[PDB]
Amino acid sequence: MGLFDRIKRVVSSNLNDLVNKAEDPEKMLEQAILEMQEDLVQLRQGVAQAIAAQKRSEKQYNDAQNEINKWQRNAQLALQKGDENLARQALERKKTYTDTSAALKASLDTQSTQVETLKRNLIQLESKISEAKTKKEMLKARITTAKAQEQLQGMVRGMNTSSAMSAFERMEEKVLMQESRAQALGELAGADLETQFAQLEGGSDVDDELAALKAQM
Amino acid sequence: RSEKQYNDAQNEINKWQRNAQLALQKGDENLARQALERKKTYTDTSAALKASLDTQSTQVETLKRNLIQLESKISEAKTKKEMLKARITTAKAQEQLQGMVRGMNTSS
Known part of the structure; x- marks a missing residue:
C-alpha cells in the first residue's frame, strides 16, 4: 500500500x-x-403532524358517533310513522355504522397509545438539549477564565515566559548589578579594612558602654 | 443565572402543585392526574438541575480562590517594585557622588 x-x-x-x-x-x-x-x-414539526393526524382520526370517529346517533333517531322516527321495511333497513344501516364506529374506536386505542410514547420522547429530548445548553454556558465561562490565566501567567520568580515579567526580572538583575557595581568602589579603595577594624574594636564597646551606664546607677 | 432559573423552576413547580391541589378539589381526576404527571416531570427536572448546580458552585469556588491568589501576587509585585525603584534612586546618588577617597579622583 x-x-x-x-x-x-x-x-x-x-x-x-x-x-x-x-x-x-x-x-x-x-x-x-x-x-x-x-x-x-x-x-x-413532526410531533405536531403526528398529533394532528391522530386528532383528525379521533374527530372522524366522533363525527361517526354523532351521525349514528342521528341515524338511530331517524330510525325511531321511521319506526313511528315510516314503514317496517324502511325502518328495518335503517336499523341495518345503523348496526353497520355502529360496528364501523366500534372498529374505529378499537383503532383509536392504539392511536392514543402511540401518541403517548411520541409525547414522552419529545419531553425527554427537550430536557436533554436544555441541559446541554446550560453546561455549554458553564464551559464557555471556563475558557474565559483560561484566557485570563494563561495570558496573566509566568509571574513566579522561577520563570519569565511573560514579556512583562521578563522585563521585570532582567531589570531586577539590572538594579542589583548597579548596586553591587557601585558598592565595589568601597573595597576597591583602601578604607574597607579600617571600617571593619573600627567595628571589631567597638562591638563590645557598645555593650561595655551599656554596662558602664548600668553600673553608674 | 443557572441558579436563578433553577429557583424559578422551583417556584413554578410550587405554583403547579398548588394548581394540582386546586384541580384535586374542583377539577377532574384525569386533568388532576395529568397535572400530577407534569409536576413530577418538572420536579425531576429541578432535581437534575440542582445536581448540576452542585458542580456549578464547586467550579465557581475554585474560580474565586484563584482570583484571590493572583490579586495577592500582583500586589506584592508592586510593593517590591517600589522598593527597588528607591534602590536605583540611591544608586544614582552613590555612583554620581563616588570617587571621593584620596586614593582615586574618577570624579571631575
Missing part, C-alpha cells in the same frame, strides 16, 4: 494540522451552538 497510502496520510496530516491550527477556541465555541438546534425544528 505504502507508495500511495502514505502519500495520503502525510498530505492529510498537513491539511488537518492546518485546519486544527486555524481554530480559535472561543469563536468556534460560539459557533458550536448555533448548529445544534437545527434538527430541533423538524422535531417540533
Whole structure:
C-alpha cells in the first residue's frame, strides 16, 4: 500500500494540522451552538403532524358517533310513522355504522397509545438539549477564565515566559548589578579594612558602654 | 443565572402543585392526574438541575480562590517594585557622588 497510502496520510496530516491550527477556541465555541438546534425544528414539526393526524382520526370517529346517533333517531322516527321495511333497513344501516364506529374506536386505542410514547420522547429530548445548553454556558465561562490565566501567567520568580515579567526580572538583575557595581568602589579603595577594624574594636564597646551606664546607677 | 432559573423552576413547580391541589378539589381526576404527571416531570427536572448546580458552585469556588491568589501576587509585585525603584534612586546618588577617597579622583 505504502507508495500511495502514505502519500495520503502525510498530505492529510498537513491539511488537518492546518485546519486544527486555524481554530480559535472561543469563536468556534460560539459557533458550536448555533448548529445544534437545527434538527430541533423538524422535531417540533413532526410531533405536531403526528398529533394532528391522530386528532383528525379521533374527530372522524366522533363525527361517526354523532351521525349514528342521528341515524338511530331517524330510525325511531321511521319506526313511528315510516314503514317496517324502511325502518328495518335503517336499523341495518345503523348496526353497520355502529360496528364501523366500534372498529374505529378499537383503532383509536392504539392511536392514543402511540401518541403517548411520541409525547414522552419529545419531553425527554427537550430536557436533554436544555441541559446541554446550560453546561455549554458553564464551559464557555471556563475558557474565559483560561484566557485570563494563561495570558496573566509566568509571574513566579522561577520563570519569565511573560514579556512583562521578563522585563521585570532582567531589570531586577539590572538594579542589583548597579548596586553591587557601585558598592565595589568601597573595597576597591583602601578604607574597607579600617571600617571593619573600627567595628571589631567597638562591638563590645557598645555593650561595655551599656554596662558602664548600668553600673553608674 | 443557572441558579436563578433553577429557583424559578422551583417556584413554578410550587405554583403547579398548588394548581394540582386546586384541580384535586374542583377539577377532574384525569386533568388532576395529568397535572400530577407534569409536576413530577418538572420536579425531576429541578432535581437534575440542582445536581448540576452542585458542580456549578464547586467550579465557581475554585474560580474565586484563584482570583484571590493572583490579586495577592500582583500586589506584592508592586510593593517590591517600589522598593527597588528607591534602590536605583540611591544608586544614582552613590555612583554620581563616588570617587571621593584620596586614593582615586574618577570624579571631575
